[PDB]
Amino acid sequence: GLLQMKLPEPVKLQMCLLLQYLCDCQVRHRIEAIVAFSDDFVAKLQDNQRFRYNEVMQALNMSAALTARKTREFRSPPQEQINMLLNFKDDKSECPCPEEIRDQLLDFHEDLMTHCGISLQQLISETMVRWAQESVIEDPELVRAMFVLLHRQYDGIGGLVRALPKTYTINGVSVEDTINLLASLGQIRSLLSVRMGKEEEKLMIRGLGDIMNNKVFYQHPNLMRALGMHETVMEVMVNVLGGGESKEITFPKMVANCCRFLCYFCRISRQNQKAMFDHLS
Amino acid sequence: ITLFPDENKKHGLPGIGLSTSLRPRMRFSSPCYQYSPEFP
Amino acid sequence: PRHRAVNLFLQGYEKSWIETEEHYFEDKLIEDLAKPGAEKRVDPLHQ
């Protein structure tokens, strides 16, 4: 009955944060389910597509249709292949050869919609509208939190479209390496908040060295960019050299280390170069 | 891990279920000062 | 590889099956937000 009691503004703000955390955990569980079904479905699709490409290759006669299928399977880049295999969102819109997987994916999408908004959300919305109708609210931060929570209840799709770009799947072999990478990234982010000094620059240099030494940086540039600490390194850069732009530049060793890290990040992958181009100005 | 714990549309209590996502390891140094002091 | 394939499928599933649904709730949401409610004072939408 804590929601139903006559709460003051700070208390209701804290429980708004609590409900927001519950929504975040629910979204995380949804992403976990999506990852599981994605694994299974992509395994089936990959084996079936390789089998059908081999079957097409077995054709004795090569013609315009055969070269069309050759471009269909081999020539197209993997992302284009995925988009092509998923073009069947509409009813019978140039679907690929399999259809059992079409039915399975449609069923999964239906149950995902059912799990999303399309009984916690109704309770949260009812409590929020009740509190809003009770009386005029004076705290702008409370009102902002109230309405962002209400909007996230009414639109669960926004969480998916804002979280799937940041989701990633790592192999079970490199779990410890991923954990070490995340720990180093957390240390860098934590040191970003505090004021700058010599001990701080030594810690950042050590963290960046561990980042270089970690093998995950080489293997998964896509995950590297998805975590996106090139932005954090740029933030450290601007923090260090904001005064130095006017005069009296500090931490030459760290600015050199940041330059080397950014150059290496650009050199590992092509898309990382495009990602870093935006800060050219 | 699946989305609905049961064949029914019952969602289940939020925050209760198997979670596999990578998370920072909890560690508290007993009071080098690497971590925060431990608590019961 | 398997991890690359599943990552590509995650991104494709987003851009195809998650970014295209358009459920209409704006009218109902505005109505319930502008409803004065029981007790005047300022409505939630006016707030």
GROMACS .gro file of C-alpha atoms in nm:
model
  368
    1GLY     CA    1   0.000   0.000   0.000
    2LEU     CA    2   0.305   0.224  -0.016
    3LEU     CA    3   0.190   0.362  -0.351
    4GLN     CA    4  -0.160   0.420  -0.210
    5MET     CA    5  -0.045   0.614   0.097
    6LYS     CA    6  -0.044   0.995   0.094
    7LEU     CA    7   0.324   1.040   0.012
    8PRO     CA    8   0.517   1.367   0.003
    9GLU     CA    9   0.704   1.485  -0.304
   10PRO     CA   10   1.054   1.349  -0.220
   11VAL     CA   11   0.913   1.008  -0.126
   12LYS     CA   12   0.706   0.984  -0.443
   13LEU     CA   13   1.014   1.090  -0.641
   14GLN     CA   14   1.218   0.808  -0.489
   15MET     CA   15   0.950   0.553  -0.571
   16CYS     CA   16   0.931   0.694  -0.925
   17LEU     CA   17   1.301   0.613  -0.951
   18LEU     CA   18   1.227   0.267  -0.809
   19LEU     CA   19   0.960   0.204  -1.073
   20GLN     CA   20   1.202   0.327  -1.339
   21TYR     CA   21   1.456   0.071  -1.219
   22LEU     CA   22   1.191  -0.202  -1.238
   23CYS     CA   23   1.112  -0.099  -1.595
   24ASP     CA   24   1.483  -0.108  -1.682
   25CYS     CA   25   1.521  -0.459  -1.541
   26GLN     CA   26   1.214  -0.575  -1.734
   27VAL     CA   27   1.362  -0.431  -2.055
   28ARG     CA   28   1.688  -0.612  -1.981
   29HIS     CA   29   1.503  -0.942  -1.944
   30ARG     CA   30   1.324  -0.874  -2.273
   31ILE     CA   31   1.661  -0.817  -2.442
   32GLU     CA   32   1.787  -1.144  -2.294
   33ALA     CA   33   1.491  -1.332  -2.443
   34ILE     CA   34   1.546  -1.158  -2.777
   35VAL     CA   35   1.913  -1.261  -2.771
   36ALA     CA   36   1.823  -1.625  -2.701
   37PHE     CA   37   1.569  -1.647  -2.982
   38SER     CA   38   1.806  -1.456  -3.210
   39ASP     CA   39   2.076  -1.716  -3.148
   40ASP     CA   40   1.845  -2.006  -3.226
   41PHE     CA   41   1.683  -1.843  -3.529
   42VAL     CA   42   2.011  -1.725  -3.680
   43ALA     CA   43   2.158  -2.074  -3.636
   44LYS     CA   44   1.866  -2.227  -3.826
   45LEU     CA   45   1.875  -1.956  -4.092
   46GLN     CA   46   2.252  -1.983  -4.141
   47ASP     CA   47   2.251  -2.361  -4.183
   48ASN     CA   48   1.950  -2.350  -4.416
   49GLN     CA   49   2.096  -2.070  -4.629
   50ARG     CA   50   2.430  -2.249  -4.661
   51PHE     CA   51   2.250  -2.571  -4.758
   52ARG     CA   52   2.039  -2.394  -5.021
   53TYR     CA   53   2.341  -2.208  -5.161
   54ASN     CA   54   2.523  -2.541  -5.195
   55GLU     CA   55   2.214  -2.687  -5.364
   56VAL     CA   56   2.203  -2.395  -5.609
   57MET     CA   57   2.574  -2.444  -5.677
   58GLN     CA   58   2.503  -2.810  -5.761
   59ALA     CA   59   2.301  -2.703  -6.067
   60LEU     CA   60   2.462  -2.836  -6.385
   61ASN     CA   61   2.349  -2.547  -6.608
   62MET     CA   62   2.459  -2.189  -6.536
   63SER     CA   63   2.228  -1.917  -6.667
   64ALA     CA   64   2.088  -1.574  -6.581
   65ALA     CA   65   1.884  -1.721  -6.295
   66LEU     CA   66   2.194  -1.902  -6.168
   67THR     CA   67   2.405  -1.586  -6.165
   68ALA     CA   68   2.114  -1.402  -6.002
   69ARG     CA   69   2.120  -1.657  -5.720
   70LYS     CA   70   2.500  -1.631  -5.707
   71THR     CA   71   2.471  -1.256  -5.646
   72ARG     CA   72   2.178  -1.332  -5.412
   73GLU     CA   73   2.392  -1.552  -5.184
   74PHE     CA   74   2.763  -1.474  -5.223
   75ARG     CA   75   2.806  -1.125  -5.368
   76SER     CA   76   2.583  -0.942  -5.121
   77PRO     CA   77   2.757  -0.831  -4.798
   78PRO     CA   78   2.646  -1.007  -4.478
   79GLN     CA   79   2.437  -0.714  -4.354
   80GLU     CA   80   2.262  -0.700  -4.691
   81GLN     CA   81   2.205  -1.075  -4.661
   82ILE     CA   82   2.043  -1.029  -4.319
   83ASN     CA   83   1.820  -0.746  -4.444
   84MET     CA   84   1.727  -0.956  -4.748
   85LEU     CA   85   1.644  -1.256  -4.530
   86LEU     CA   86   1.434  -1.031  -4.304
   87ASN     CA   87   1.253  -0.845  -4.585
   88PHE     CA   88   0.945  -1.065  -4.530
   89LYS     CA   89   0.801  -0.836  -4.261
   90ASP     CA   90   0.510  -0.770  -4.496
   91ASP     CA   91   0.283  -1.056  -4.599
   92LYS     CA   92   0.466  -1.256  -4.869
   93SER     CA   93   0.693  -0.966  -4.967
   94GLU     CA   94   0.973  -1.141  -5.158
   95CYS     CA   95   1.035  -1.382  -4.872
   96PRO     CA   96   1.337  -1.616  -4.875
   97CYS     CA   97   1.304  -1.987  -4.951
   98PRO     CA   98   1.221  -2.101  -4.593
   99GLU     CA   99   0.874  -2.038  -4.453
  100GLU     CA  100   0.874  -2.241  -4.130
  101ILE     CA  101   1.127  -1.992  -3.996
  102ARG     CA  102   0.896  -1.715  -4.119
  103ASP     CA  103   0.618  -1.862  -3.906
  104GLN     CA  104   0.852  -1.902  -3.608
  105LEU     CA  105   0.978  -1.543  -3.632
  106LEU     CA  106   0.623  -1.411  -3.667
  107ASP     CA  107   0.522  -1.603  -3.355
  108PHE     CA  108   0.823  -1.468  -3.165
  109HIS     CA  109   0.745  -1.113  -3.275
  110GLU     CA  110   0.384  -1.158  -3.164
  111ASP     CA  111   0.482  -1.282  -2.819
  112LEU     CA  112   0.743  -1.006  -2.789
  113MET     CA  113   0.472  -0.750  -2.864
  114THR     CA  114   0.251  -0.917  -2.603
  115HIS     CA  115   0.531  -0.900  -2.346
  116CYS     CA  116   0.571  -0.533  -2.437
  117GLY     CA  117   0.287  -0.281  -2.417
  118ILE     CA  118   0.136  -0.399  -2.745
  119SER     CA  119   0.038  -0.601  -1.495
  120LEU     CA  120   0.303  -0.343  -1.406
  121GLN     CA  121   0.262  -0.077  -1.676
  122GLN     CA  122  -0.109  -0.029  -1.610
  123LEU     CA  123  -0.045   0.004  -1.236
  124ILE     CA  124   0.233   0.259  -1.292
  125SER     CA  125   0.024   0.465  -1.533
  126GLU     CA  126  -0.279   0.459  -1.302
  127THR     CA  127  -0.073   0.568  -1.000
  128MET     CA  128   0.092   0.846  -1.200
  129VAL     CA  129  -0.233   0.987  -1.336
  130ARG     CA  130  -0.390   0.961  -0.989
  131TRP     CA  131  -0.103   1.153  -0.828
  132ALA     CA  132  -0.110   1.415  -1.104
  133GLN     CA  133  -0.484   1.465  -1.059
  134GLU     CA  134  -0.454   1.481  -0.679
  135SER     CA  135  -0.301   1.829  -0.665
  136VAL     CA  136  -0.066   2.074  -0.833
  137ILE     CA  137   0.297   1.959  -0.816
  138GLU     CA  138   0.567   2.215  -0.740
  139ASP     CA  139   0.890   2.023  -0.812
  140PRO     CA  140   0.998   2.049  -1.179
  141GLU     CA  141   1.231   1.752  -1.136
  142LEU     CA  142   0.948   1.546  -0.987
  143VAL     CA  143   0.721   1.641  -1.278
  144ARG     CA  144   0.991   1.554  -1.532
  145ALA     CA  145   1.056   1.214  -1.375
  146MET     CA  146   0.681   1.154  -1.351
  147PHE     CA  147   0.622   1.222  -1.719
  148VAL     CA  148   0.928   1.036  -1.849
  149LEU     CA  149   0.818   0.732  -1.649
  150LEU     CA  150   0.461   0.765  -1.780
  151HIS     CA  151   0.589   0.794  -2.137
  152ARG     CA  152   0.812   0.488  -2.099
  153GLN     CA  153   0.511   0.293  -1.971
  154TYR     CA  154   0.299   0.403  -2.266
  155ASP     CA  155   0.581   0.332  -2.516
  156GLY     CA  156   0.779   0.017  -2.447
  157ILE     CA  157   0.901   0.009  -2.806
  158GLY     CA  158   1.121   0.312  -2.742
  159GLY     CA  159   1.327   0.110  -2.497
  160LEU     CA  160   1.379  -0.159  -2.759
  161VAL     CA  161   1.480   0.080  -3.036
  162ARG     CA  162   1.715   0.263  -2.799
  163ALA     CA  163   1.867  -0.054  -2.647
  164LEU     CA  164   1.908  -0.295  -2.940
  165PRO     CA  165   2.176  -0.068  -3.096
  166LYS     CA  166   2.370  -0.102  -2.769
  167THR     CA  167   2.313  -0.475  -2.715
  168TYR     CA  168   2.585  -0.721  -2.810
  169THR     CA  169   2.659  -1.093  -2.785
  170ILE     CA  170   3.005  -1.216  -2.687
  171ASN     CA  171   3.132  -1.572  -2.707
  172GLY     CA  172   3.158  -1.772  -2.386
  173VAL     CA  173   3.532  -1.823  -2.432
  174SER     CA  174   3.619  -1.453  -2.385
  175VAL     CA  175   3.388  -1.383  -2.089
  176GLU     CA  176   3.679  -1.304  -1.858
  177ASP     CA  177   3.836  -1.075  -2.119
  178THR     CA  178   3.504  -0.894  -2.162
  179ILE     CA  179   3.474  -0.855  -1.785
  180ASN     CA  180   3.825  -0.711  -1.762
  181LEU     CA  181   3.750  -0.471  -2.049
  182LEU     CA  182   3.430  -0.356  -1.877
  183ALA     CA  183   3.615  -0.310  -1.548
  184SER     CA  184   3.880  -0.095  -1.714
  185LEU     CA  185   3.610   0.108  -1.890
  186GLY     CA  186   3.430   0.159  -1.560
  187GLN     CA  187   3.753   0.279  -1.399
  188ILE     CA  188   3.809   0.528  -1.682
  189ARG     CA  189   3.451   0.656  -1.656
  190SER     CA  190   3.478   0.691  -1.278
  191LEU     CA  191   3.807   0.880  -1.306
  192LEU     CA  192   3.643   1.108  -1.564
  193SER     CA  193   3.420   1.261  -1.296
  194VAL     CA  194   3.693   1.358  -1.048
  195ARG     CA  195   3.922   1.658  -1.087
  196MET     CA  196   4.240   1.616  -1.289
  197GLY     CA  197   4.586   1.559  -1.140
  198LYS     CA  198   4.905   1.360  -1.182
  199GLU     CA  199   4.773   1.051  -1.005
  200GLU     CA  200   4.461   1.073  -1.221
  201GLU     CA  201   4.665   1.084  -1.542
  202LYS     CA  202   4.875   0.789  -1.428
  203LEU     CA  203   4.559   0.587  -1.363
  204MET     CA  204   4.414   0.680  -1.703
  205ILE     CA  205   4.741   0.586  -1.876
  206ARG     CA  206   4.742   0.248  -1.700
  207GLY     CA  207   4.378   0.191  -1.797
  208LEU     CA  208   4.444   0.280  -2.161
  209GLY     CA  209   4.743   0.046  -2.163
  210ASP     CA  210   4.523  -0.236  -2.035
  211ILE     CA  211   4.272  -0.145  -2.306
  212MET     CA  212   4.538  -0.181  -2.575
  213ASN     CA  213   4.664  -0.508  -2.428
  214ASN     CA  214   4.313  -0.656  -2.413
  215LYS     CA  215   4.245  -0.876  -2.716
  216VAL     CA  216   3.874  -0.786  -2.728
  217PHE     CA  217   3.969  -0.447  -2.874
  218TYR     CA  218   4.116  -0.615  -3.183
  219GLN     CA  219   3.850  -0.883  -3.221
  220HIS     CA  220   3.525  -0.684  -3.187
  221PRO     CA  221   3.548  -0.327  -3.319
  222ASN     CA  222   3.168  -0.327  -3.342
  223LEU     CA  223   3.134  -0.394  -2.969
  224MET     CA  224   3.419  -0.149  -2.915
  225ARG     CA  225   3.222   0.131  -3.081
  226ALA     CA  226   2.896   0.017  -2.919
  227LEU     CA  227   3.053   0.069  -2.578
  228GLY     CA  228   3.177   0.392  -2.733
  229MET     CA  229   3.456   0.509  -2.504
  230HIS     CA  230   3.613   0.694  -2.795
  231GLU     CA  231   3.364   0.959  -2.684
  232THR     CA  232   3.489   0.931  -2.325
  233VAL     CA  233   3.850   0.963  -2.441
  234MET     CA  234   3.749   1.272  -2.639
  235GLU     CA  235   3.583   1.405  -2.323
  236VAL     CA  236   3.907   1.351  -2.131
  237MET     CA  237   4.090   1.524  -2.417
  238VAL     CA  238   3.869   1.834  -2.410
  239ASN     CA  239   3.881   1.845  -2.030
  240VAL     CA  240   4.262   1.838  -2.037
  241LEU     CA  241   4.316   2.087  -2.319
  242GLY     CA  242   4.030   2.333  -2.270
  243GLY     CA  243   4.262   2.567  -2.085
  244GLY     CA  244   4.556   2.474  -2.307
  245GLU     CA  245   4.367   2.603  -2.610
  246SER     CA  246   4.389   2.952  -2.462
  247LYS     CA  247   4.735   2.894  -2.309
  248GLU     CA  248   4.947   2.674  -2.081
  249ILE     CA  249   4.869   2.324  -2.205
  250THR     CA  250   4.892   2.054  -1.937
  251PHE     CA  251   4.944   1.678  -1.934
  252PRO     CA  252   5.141   1.639  -2.260
  253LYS     CA  253   5.194   1.270  -2.184
  254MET     CA  254   4.821   1.203  -2.147
  255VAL     CA  255   4.725   1.404  -2.452
  256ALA     CA  256   4.983   1.200  -2.645
  257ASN     CA  257   4.835   0.878  -2.504
  258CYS     CA  258   4.485   0.988  -2.605
  259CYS     CA  259   4.610   1.068  -2.956
  260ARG     CA  260   4.770   0.725  -2.985
  261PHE     CA  261   4.456   0.553  -2.857
  262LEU     CA  262   4.236   0.740  -3.104
  263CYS     CA  263   4.471   0.668  -3.395
  264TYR     CA  264   4.481   0.297  -3.307
  265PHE     CA  265   4.101   0.291  -3.269
  266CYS     CA  266   4.066   0.447  -3.614
  267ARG     CA  267   4.318   0.207  -3.767
  268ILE     CA  268   4.161  -0.116  -3.636
  269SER     CA  269   3.842  -0.081  -3.842
  270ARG     CA  270   3.696   0.121  -4.127
  271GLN     CA  271   3.367   0.211  -3.958
  272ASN     CA  272   3.560   0.338  -3.655
  273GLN     CA  273   3.727   0.589  -3.887
  274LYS     CA  274   3.384   0.714  -3.995
  275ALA     CA  275   3.273   0.727  -3.632
  276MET     CA  276   3.576   0.938  -3.538
  277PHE     CA  277   3.543   1.163  -3.844
  278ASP     CA  278   3.258   1.356  -3.681
  279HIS     CA  279   3.506   1.510  -3.435
  280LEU     CA  280   3.731   1.631  -3.720
  281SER     CA  281   3.628   1.994  -3.673
  282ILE     CA  282   1.627  -1.772  -2.087
  283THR     CA  283   1.284  -1.701  -2.239
  284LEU     CA  284   1.039  -1.412  -2.214
  285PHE     CA  285   0.727  -1.565  -2.056
  286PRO     CA  286   0.803  -1.804  -1.767
  287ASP     CA  287   0.480  -1.996  -1.834
  288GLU     CA  288   0.276  -2.084  -2.141
  289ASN     CA  289   0.026  -1.831  -2.004
  290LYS     CA  290   0.067  -1.461  -2.077
  291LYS     CA  291   0.167  -1.411  -1.712
  292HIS     CA  292   0.473  -1.185  -1.717
  293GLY     CA  293   0.595  -1.266  -1.366
  294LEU     CA  294   0.723  -1.036  -1.096
  295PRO     CA  295   0.976  -0.788  -1.241
  296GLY     CA  296   1.339  -0.839  -1.146
  297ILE     CA  297   1.285  -1.208  -1.062
  298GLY     CA  298   1.442  -1.448  -1.309
  299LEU     CA  299   1.764  -1.570  -1.463
  300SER     CA  300   1.998  -1.292  -1.579
  301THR     CA  301   2.310  -1.362  -1.783
  302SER     CA  302   2.437  -1.015  -1.878
  303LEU     CA  303   2.795  -0.925  -1.793
  304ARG     CA  304   2.806  -0.718  -1.475
  305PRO     CA  305   3.093  -0.578  -1.267
  306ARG     CA  306   3.211  -0.816  -0.998
  307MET     CA  307   3.127  -0.708  -0.644
  308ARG     CA  308   3.437  -0.670  -0.428
  309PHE     CA  309   3.485  -0.485  -0.098
  310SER     CA  310   3.826  -0.456   0.066
  311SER     CA  311   3.834  -0.520   0.440
  312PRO     CA  312   3.880  -0.190   0.632
  313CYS     CA  313   4.590  -0.025  -0.070
  314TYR     CA  314   4.231   0.103  -0.044
  315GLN     CA  315   4.139  -0.046  -0.380
  316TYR     CA  316   3.769  -0.087  -0.296
  317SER     CA  317   3.510   0.036  -0.049
  318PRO     CA  318   3.506  -0.110   0.305
  319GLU     CA  319   3.303  -0.427   0.349
  320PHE     CA  320   2.964  -0.424   0.524
  321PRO     CA  321   2.729  -0.692   0.663
  322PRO     CA  322   3.086  -1.695  -3.708
  323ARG     CA  323   2.796  -1.760  -3.470
  324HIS     CA  324   2.845  -1.442  -3.265
  325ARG     CA  325   2.876  -1.227  -3.578
  326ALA     CA  326   2.563  -1.385  -3.725
  327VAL     CA  327   2.356  -1.334  -3.411
  328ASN     CA  328   2.474  -0.972  -3.377
  329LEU     CA  329   2.376  -0.904  -3.739
  330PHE     CA  330   2.039  -1.067  -3.674
  331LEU     CA  331   1.986  -0.848  -3.367
  332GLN     CA  332   2.050  -0.533  -3.570
  333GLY     CA  333   1.836  -0.651  -3.862
  334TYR     CA  334   1.553  -0.757  -3.632
  335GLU     CA  335   1.560  -0.412  -3.477
  336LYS     CA  336   1.558  -0.220  -3.805
  337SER     CA  337   1.289  -0.444  -3.959
  338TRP     CA  338   1.055  -0.586  -3.693
  339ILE     CA  339   1.086  -0.329  -3.414
  340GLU     CA  340   1.123   0.006  -3.591
  341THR     CA  341   0.813  -0.033  -3.811
  342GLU     CA  342   0.527  -0.093  -3.566
  343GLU     CA  343   0.311   0.219  -3.526
  344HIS     CA  344   0.059   0.169  -3.246
  345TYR     CA  345  -0.179   0.464  -3.207
  346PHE     CA  346  -0.210   0.575  -2.844
  347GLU     CA  347  -0.171   0.953  -2.870
  348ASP     CA  348  -0.542   1.037  -2.867
  349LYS     CA  349  -0.626   0.814  -2.571
  350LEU     CA  350  -0.319   0.930  -2.377
  351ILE     CA  351  -0.404   1.297  -2.434
  352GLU     CA  352  -0.765   1.233  -2.334
  353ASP     CA  353  -0.679   1.061  -2.006
  354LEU     CA  354  -0.410   1.320  -1.931
  355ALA     CA  355  -0.646   1.613  -1.993
  356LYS     CA  356  -0.932   1.453  -1.799
  357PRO     CA  357  -0.980   1.676  -1.491
  358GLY     CA  358  -1.049   1.380  -1.263
  359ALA     CA  359  -1.245   1.360  -0.940
  360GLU     CA  360  -1.208   1.602  -0.650
  361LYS     CA  361  -1.082   2.308  -0.925
  362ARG     CA  362  -0.707   2.270  -0.982
  363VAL     CA  363  -0.475   2.236  -1.281
  364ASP     CA  364  -0.514   1.931  -1.503
  365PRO     CA  365  -0.208   1.708  -1.559
  366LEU     CA  366  -0.176   1.810  -1.924
  367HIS     CA  367  -0.188   2.177  -1.829
  368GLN     CA  368   0.078   2.109  -1.565
   0.00000   0.00000   0.00000
